[PDB]
Write a protein that binds this ligand. Structure first.
Ligand SMILES: CC1=C(/C=C/C(C)=C/C=C/C(C)=C/C=C/C=C(C)/C=C/C=C(C)/C=C/C2=C(C)C(=O)CCC2(C)C)C(C)(C)CCC1=O
Length: 320
């Protein structure tokens, strides 16, 4: 009947932005030097219309030792470390970076971007010439919508460093968890077409960084699938993902539809936008949420999708 694997397929008319993994695959064909140059140029152009937020103090304490090593290196040595990261080389810095959470790696590169601008780290060489393929990948990124662009950039960062699979057993380094926003101060979401209390609780608890309440919405074996990734299965792993990767999001759902399927279960699709704390309101990612709920309104499965275009925000099929 329903398994996690079959639940992945609900609302199959939902068109996701698979140009993100497509573009990443093209990017991964390029030399390390062209990868760095390409991201430099893309980030420079993006900055003209989107506004990145500075990393917090606790984010940066974990990257500090590595950044100070870099601050001291020659321009040549600095470039070599950056190429090592892009190449996923086996070096001490690449092994250190492999155990950092997503947001720590992002803060590392945001500091390097500042330093490269303002003189401290080796710039991209003046008159650098991208390969023909790299020039085309950069143009492809320019034509993506902002939500797709920042997803490509983040993925490129997350994939650098030594393969964490190749490390064995290892302590993942992550920020302290923010406290749940006071109940009184929360702003509840509204969703046109949906009043299911679990769906509203999922949105509101995530918006409040209240992961202990969020996780109780799931079945013990319930799964969550982030954009372009495999399902994270079971409360233990979902709860860790929440606390590690999901703080300070702003979910802005707009509309949804609900459909009874077999055995008192119910499949629900919501569309809307999401803001990441890295860009705030300057980037609104067009998202769908696809939930499979038990008769007791528990989340058996939820998939979160980055949508191919804004048209898909209105794609809400009520009968299958
Ligand atoms: C690297 C590099 C550079 C620098 C580059 C830099 C500094 C790049 C920086 C890039 C940054 C900061 C990108 C951040 C992206 C964040 C995203 C896509 C978050 C999405 C979250 C979502 C969708 C969450 C959704 C969620 C919802 C709704 C749920 O319902 C459930 C949870 C879930 C998580 C699934 C240089 C400029 C120096 C050039 C050299 C070079 O290589």
């Amino acid at each position: 009947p329903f398994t996690i694997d079959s639940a992945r397929g609900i609302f199959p008319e939902t068109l996701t932005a698979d140009s993100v993994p497509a573009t990443i695959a093209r990017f991964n064909q390029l030399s390390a030097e062209d990868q760095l140059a390409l991201i430099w140029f893309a980030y420079l152009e993006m900055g003209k219309t989107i506004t990145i937020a500075a990393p917090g103090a606790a984010n940066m304490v974990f990257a500090e030792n590595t950044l100070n090593e870099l601050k001291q290196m020659s321009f040549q040595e600095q470039t070599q470390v950056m190429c090592d990261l892009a190449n996923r080389a086996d070096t001490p810095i690449c092994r250190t970076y492999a155990i950092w959470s997503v947001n720590i790696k992002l803060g590392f590169w945001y500091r390097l971007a500042e330093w490269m601008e303002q003189g401290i780290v080796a710039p991209i060489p003046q008159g650098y010439r991208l390969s023909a393929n790299a020039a085309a990948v950069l143009q492809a990124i320019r034509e993506l919508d902002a939500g797709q662009q920042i997803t490509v950039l983040r993925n490129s960062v997350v994939d650098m460093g030594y393969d964490p699979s190749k490390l064995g057993s290892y302590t993942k380094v992550s920020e302290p968890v923010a406290p749940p926003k006071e109940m009184a101060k929360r702003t509840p979401v509204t969703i046109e077409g949906i009043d299911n209390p679990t769906i509203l609780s999922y949105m509101d608890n995530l918006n409040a960084n209240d992961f202990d309440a969020l996780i109780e919405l799931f079945t013990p074996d319930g799964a969550l699938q982030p954009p372009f990734q495999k399902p994270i299965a079971g409360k233990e792993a979902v709860y860790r993902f929440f606390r590690e990767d999901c703080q300070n999001l702003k979910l802005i759902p707009q509309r949804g539809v609900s459909e009874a399927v077999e055995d008192g279960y119910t499949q629900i699709k919501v569309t809307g936008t999401v803001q990441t704390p890295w860009f705030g309101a300057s980037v609104g990612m067009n998202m769908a949420w696809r939930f499979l709920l038990t008769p007791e309104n528990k989340i058996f499965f939820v998939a979160i999708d980055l949508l191919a275009s804004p048209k898909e925000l209105l794609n809400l099929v009520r009968h299958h």
